[PDB]
């Protein structure tokens, strides 16, 4: 049983020079690249990824932040959405824990260089919202014997 | 004072080629590679191995999937026992902390990439069931003034 | 605010080769290098590095593994002399977090690689004594932009 999230490598990532390097951590573990794409996201697209935070004072920062080129992915995997989480670290990387992406890469959270989905409503609103069904692609890693039990 | 603990590399660290990587992180830590050797794992071996759990339900299933090549290892340093359980993460990857090998790697514990001896006691037991003693090998690390206190 | 902290590559870090692995893992969060210099720790900078410990038994040989080549450093970012001390881990490399330099490198207290500041005051005195104003370095990272909210 695997599921699907969407993971973001917000302009930070990008303008760093390290999407490489963050998609290795997602592999590492098996994970299969299920969508990728290259943008650069708009404020309206931005306003409803972020509906949740719709009329808080820190939102325009926070969309101003994020207009900019953006690596949208879809990595599949068991309990992929609580453990691309976990993987990334808490929001502030001060907090974050050592090994987590942003404790490893990050000092602050309006630069804490990825996002993924907080839920699986939320991974199916994500991938619906920056991809369309045609851009998500089904095939099966060779190694899967290895990798599920 | 240093122990010797059996660490094991599972099928699924071989077939995934990750045999190096996951040397590399014992022997950065100054631990001594004591034993190391090839071997396809047999079933009556792996009965042997997995002794304790004779007649559950998941045994059968288990030895499947640790019946292929393997890598035996013995590693000695500080505590090592311990520190070797410490560095693989929990049995389940999924509960195992950021940075160890089971997280940075694996997604189920039915393929958790590694085996490392859980006490003293099965340490002793699993050396002498992989190895002959004659392959446990007697040398000191030039750098030890460097790594021991 | 960012500020700056001590940090300093221990003798067992020259000799066992791994400098360039350490200063890596401080610029991979965007940390600035505003000062580093190779020296030979003497006994007389290092009971005054070590003051706090004066009068008391272990110093002494503290002193004698501490005398040999060091790196001195220091690194700017936010929260940086927290943050650093986190990174490092434990002073017991095997109490220390995986994914911390000391849990990564290290077996045992008394060659645990590195030192860096505990505190504010701390971080003031250590870069006194070990750098002159004038050795310590001001520029700009050119990410600063993405590494910084
Ligand atoms: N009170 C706040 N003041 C300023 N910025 C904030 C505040 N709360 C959140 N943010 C910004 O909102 C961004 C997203 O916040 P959220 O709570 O969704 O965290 P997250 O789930 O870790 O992030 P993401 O969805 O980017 O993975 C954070 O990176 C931070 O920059
Ligand atoms: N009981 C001990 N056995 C061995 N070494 C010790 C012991 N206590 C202290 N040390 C050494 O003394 C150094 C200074 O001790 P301290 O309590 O200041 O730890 P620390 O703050 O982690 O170290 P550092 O100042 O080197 O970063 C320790 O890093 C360790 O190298
Ligand atoms: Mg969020
Ligand atoms: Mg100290």
Known sequence: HVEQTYLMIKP??????????IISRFEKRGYRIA??????????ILEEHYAEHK???????L?????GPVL??????????AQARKMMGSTRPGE????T???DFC??????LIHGSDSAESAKREISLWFKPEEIQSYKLALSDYIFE
Do not use: H, S, W, Y
């Open 12 to 21: 930070d990532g990008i303008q760093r020079q390290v999407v490489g390097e």
């Open 35 to 44: 969508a990728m794409k290259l943008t650069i996201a708009t404020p309206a």
């Open 55 to 61: 009329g808080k004072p820190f939102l325009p920062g």
């Open 63 to 67: 969309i101003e932040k994020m207009t």
């Open 72 to 81: 949208c992915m879809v990595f599949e995997g068991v309990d992929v959405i």
């Open 96 to 99: 974050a824990a050592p090994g």
């Open 101 to 103: 992406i942003r404790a």
């Open 107 to 112: 000092q602050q959270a309006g630069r804490n």
